């Protein structure tokens, strides 16, 4: 028996425009007696959940949570709870979830660091890292997009915000994407896109590829003409 309550990240609030609260119960016996309504600070609740599975890959029970909370309720920070109805529990278990209170609001700075020359010499795979430094609150959501449209999440693996060493109230994440060296050597543009509740349009993106990222040579060609020109 395992029960986890997960708050809604800002990414879910932004992209899906809906704040969904998930209290999932997995790896336990099946009884099909699940009916959970997310209770507000007072006794009332908003709605019930949906799509509970009576089977699991390890032949157990798997439950999910579902809610639709108005966003100003999340902004104000009223405490929320999930209580279980499943008959396996002799006593219902309550999981408490809520938004942390009035923090600051700094904005991220995104830096793309290309693979090191030593790693590129091995001709195995190159790792490109996206550093998000400086933000505040602790939520950030980074996506990777190889030359055009999105890379699928097996590939990269961003970490979790962890307080920056020497800047009291800002944080930093780190997302690493592993690619084939040819792919990096052909010359593909890889883009890191960050969604944060502090950026201009909540999102930004920085792209780097073969020749922009720490190139060995600069190849320019200034061709100024008509230096006179009746101005």
């Amino acid at each position: 028996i395992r029960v986890f309550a997960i708050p809604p990240s800002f990414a879910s609030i932004f992209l899906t425009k809906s704040t969904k609260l998930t209290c999932l119960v997995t790896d336990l016996t099946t009884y099909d007696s699940v009916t959970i309504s997310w209770t507000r600070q007072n006794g009332e609740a908003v709605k019930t959940h949906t799509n509970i599975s009576e089977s699991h890959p390890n032949a157990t029970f798997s439950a999910v949570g579902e809610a639709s909370i108005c966003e100003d309720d999340w902004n104000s920070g009223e405490r929320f709870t999930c209580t279980v109805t499943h008959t396996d529990l002799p006593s219902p278990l309550k999981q408490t979830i809520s938004r942390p209170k009035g923090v600051a609001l700094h904005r991220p700075d995104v830096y793309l660091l290309p693979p090191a020359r030593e790693q590129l010499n091995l001709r195995e795979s190159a790792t490109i890292t996206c550093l998000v430094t400086g933000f505040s609150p602790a939520d950030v959501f980074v996506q990777w997009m190889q030359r055009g449209q999105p890379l699928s999440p097996e590939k990269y693996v961003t970490s979790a915000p962890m307080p920056e060493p020497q800047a009291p109230g800002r944080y930093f994440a780190h997302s690493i994407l592993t690619v084939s060296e040819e792919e990096w050597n052909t010359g593909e543009t890889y883009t890191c896109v960050v969604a944060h509740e502090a950026l201009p349009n909540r999102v930004t993106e920085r792209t780097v590829d073969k020749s922009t990222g720490k190139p060995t040579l600069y190849n320019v060609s200034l061709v100024m003409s008509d230096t006179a020109g009746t101005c």
Binding site: T189, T191, L199, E205, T207, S221, G229
Partner: protein, 106 residues
């Protein structure tokens, strides 16, 4: 004393003119032309397209500036692009801010 002939922020091209008075007489004042050009050296060919190839050849024709592909972001101008942000199943096209300082809504 400089007379700023042009200041093109699409190409970082500033032309100013000055009558420098070296000697203390007439007909020995040098009329100048101070062309100043800042080369991006890491900007893409398509400034509004991040994935376009890097720009290596920079052409500046001082007549087209005295009076269109840009070379440098203007700091007063909000440059944005569109990126797909797939999160869940819901892929959504979102307006990413290429220049974040200048793209805050008023």
């Amino acid at each position: 004393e400089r007379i700023v002939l042009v200041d093109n922020k699409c190409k970082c091209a500033r032309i100013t003119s000055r009558i420098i008075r070296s000697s203390e007489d007439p007909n020995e004042d040098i009329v100048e032309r101070n062309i100043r050009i800042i080369v991006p050296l890491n900007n893409r060919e398509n400034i509004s397209d991040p994935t376009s190839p890097l720009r290596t050849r920079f052409v500046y024709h001082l007549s087209d500036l005295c009076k269109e592909t840009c070379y440098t972001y203007d700091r007063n101008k909000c440059y944005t692009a569109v990126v797909p942000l797939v999160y869940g199943g819901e892929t959504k096209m979102v307006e990413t801010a290429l220049t974040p300082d200048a793209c805050y809504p008023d």
